Design a protein around this ligand. Structure first.
Ligand code: CHL
Ligand code: CHL
Ligand code: CHL
Ligand code: CHL
Lengths: 163, 161, 158, 157
């Protein structure tokens, strides 16, 4: 079924959304620790009215649940020599969600799935391993859980349309 | 003239209420250091990232906020790494006359006046007693400065929801 | 009350530049203590091995003697924080970080240089001694409670 | 093709740590070139007077000779950028900044050490003739490719 934004509207590809914690403000790039400048992790900002850095969603126009999608940050400046597409840092113990993925490659494929009770609330899952969060340098950073795909340690998200 | 300052919704501005100060003329106004010689206190820059609303401010009077009256602007943030206040003030020592943080909200050094600006309703300028607030190129982008006397930096007040 | 000696066994002089080098990575340098405090600055051991530290000058309220009141002040051509380069204790913090911005003439900034353990020319800063704690940029100097002292040497800047 | 000498008049050896010190503040260090580029890093002259620089090792594709192809590589126990510590030229930039992340075995990273005017043990870096100079940048003078920045090699103790 279609993924819906905060207005209950269906999500469209090539359209800007803030990924907002459903559970501080939105999701933003920050470095994961002082050993890795590039590429960037994804942190929940502690500043309450910051909407997040907007993303666009691509499919390898509707965005459906349980389908392969790629998440790419939308930004006019990007100091790192790699892509704005989300992916998994394999090398790290933490399994941080990091930038620099290939939007066309399977390394960057996440699936949007329903989370708990409330409507328009979702989780990101990788194929079932769900996206959660861990304490890091700049705050909670998105990570891949070890998980059998439950909502226990999953980081719940909403999609707010950027106007 | 002493009429109420209005937000983007045409509603009258209230004290102790959060507003983004948005350029009326990139996103909102945010703290950043003015240059690589001064870490604290902070200047006020227009962010180049288009959907960033700014860091919210609250307005205080030494509940309505009126034009041509003494007010103090104070940033609202849960964390503040500099050892000084979130209240806007003028950096006297600098040639540029940067608007900086660390002022005393109760002291006259921090008093600005909100006045009507040129084109369009709900558009304002900040003036200090007449010396208006403009902008200059700096490290992180346009930084708010005090002018000498066209060059005013027009602003709107958006209510934080 | 005997003279403090540098790495060359020479007596320490006031108004003379020294690197404070860990006796136990490189020298001691200003860094912020955590992401909540930009200014003033803490004192961290750099992890880069050939960095000598930021030089300090020592003042007395020309010889620098052990067990006497001295003030340690960083020597740098640029200083972005709006406070002094003089070491002092951050009372407000739980960690009791040694921070910059003290008054060199005030007692808040007085440390005493005392002998440490075995080796010659090895000292500690003090009956509460200066130790170290894990922080943002590495080991940061702290005041210990009431073994854990951070041993130091003074290298003359040439 | 005579040997490059350090500040002690000793011949330079490969796989040996040297500070590259301005022959004309302190030594040469990594810093980002501007606020648009975090990685890879440029090479700036530190304004802090007693800082020796970040040490480098020199490799040849044990003596280091003038007018021969060499590669300069920073020596550090930590490196936050996802690329090499080997110096190279930023082609894409207008400024032609000397940046990190080159391949020490590839020709993109080859510089030549040549004698510089008057004083002994004073050298310049040249790329094949285009010499390495400096330009104003965010953190101070940054090394660039001209269309010369005199240097000395101090042995790390
Ligand atoms: C104002 C904030 C401030 C911050 C955040 C720092 C942070 C630091 N200082 Mg200090 N300093 C700061 C103020 C000042 N320092 C100094 C003088 C020095 C000296 C002499 C030295 C330092 C060094 C260091 C480093 C110590 C830990 C380490 O070994 O890193 C490991 C080093 C890395 C480069 C790892 C890279 C981490 C990376 C993920 C991003 C950070 C890179 C930047 C160097 C840090 C960005 C902040 C910069 C602008 C200071 C650390 C990067 C030492 C150093 O390491 O020099 C570079 C050193 O020798 N400081 C002065 C006097 C002018 C200051 C005045 O304000
Ligand atoms: C993005 C990465 C990065 C950045 C921004 C810097 C920045 C700098 N390095 Mg480098 N480095 C960086 C990577 C690395 N450095 C090094 C190794 C060294 C060495 C050995 C030395 C430097 C030094 C310097 C400084 C040279 C200019 C100066 O003399 O300042 C004057 C010094 C100040 C402290 C100026 C005070 C202003 C500053 C604290 C204000 C804060 C700035 C803003 C918050 C903006 C920063 C955000 C962005 C740009 C990252 C400058 C602070 C030299 C130095 O000066 O030591 C500190 C030096 O000796 N670097 C390594 C190898 C581990 C790196 C690897 O990633
Ligand atoms: C290495 C690069 C990099 C770093 C270190 C950061 C870091 C950060 N980003 Mg990100 N970002 C970075 C790249 C990018 N960001 C973004 C887009 C955004 C957005 C839209 C937002 C952030 C926000 C944040 C903050 C999230 C934590 C917080 O809530 O702090 C809150 C606390 C403070 C702002 C005060 C913290 C004090 C700080 C000055 C201390 C730093 C001390 C030293 C100088 C150390 C410097 C670190 C080294 C590694 C360079 C954090 C400061 C969010 C934010 O909060 O606004 C800034 C936010 O809304 N980022 C883009 C796309 C343009 C990037 C591309 O490179
Ligand atoms: C020395 C302290 C300090 C510094 C250097 C900065 C710097 C900045 N702030 Mg600020 N701030 C600082 C203190 C504080 N800020 C804030 C709250 C905010 C907000 C809400 C916002 C900013 C934003 C900005 C940016 C404005 C220009 C831009 O649009 O770049 C855009 C370009 C990039 C983000 C690319 C990254 C460039 C890269 C080379 C540097 C590394 C990125 C880091 C985010 C900056 C360094 C880390 C630390 C020092 C913040 C700029 C990165 C705006 C922003 O853009 O958020 C990220 C913004 O919306 N600031 C608070 C209250 C908590 C502070 C308290 O002290």
């Amino acid at each position: 079924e279609p993924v819906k934004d905060t207005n209950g509207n269906p999500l469209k590809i090539e359209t800007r959304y803030f990924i907002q914690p459903a559970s501080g403000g939105g999701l933003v790039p920050a470095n994961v620790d002082l050993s890795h400048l590039c590429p960037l992790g994804i942190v929940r900002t502690s500043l309450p009215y910051q909407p997040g850095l907007p993303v666009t969603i691509s499919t390898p126009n509707d965005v459906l649940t349980n389908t392969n999608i790629a998440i790419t940050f939308d930004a006019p400046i990007w100091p790192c020599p790699s892509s704005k597409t989300w992916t998994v840092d394999s090398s790290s113990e933490e399994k941080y969600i990091i930038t620099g993925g290939d939007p066309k490659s399977g390394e960057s494929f996440f699936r949007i799935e329903k989370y708990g009770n409330g409507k328009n609330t979702y989780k990101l899952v990788r194929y079932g391993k769900s996206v959660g969060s861990t304490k890091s340098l700049w705050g909670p950073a998105l990570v891949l859980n070890d998980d059998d795909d439950s909502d226990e340690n999953a980081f719940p998200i909403k999609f707010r349309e950027v106007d």
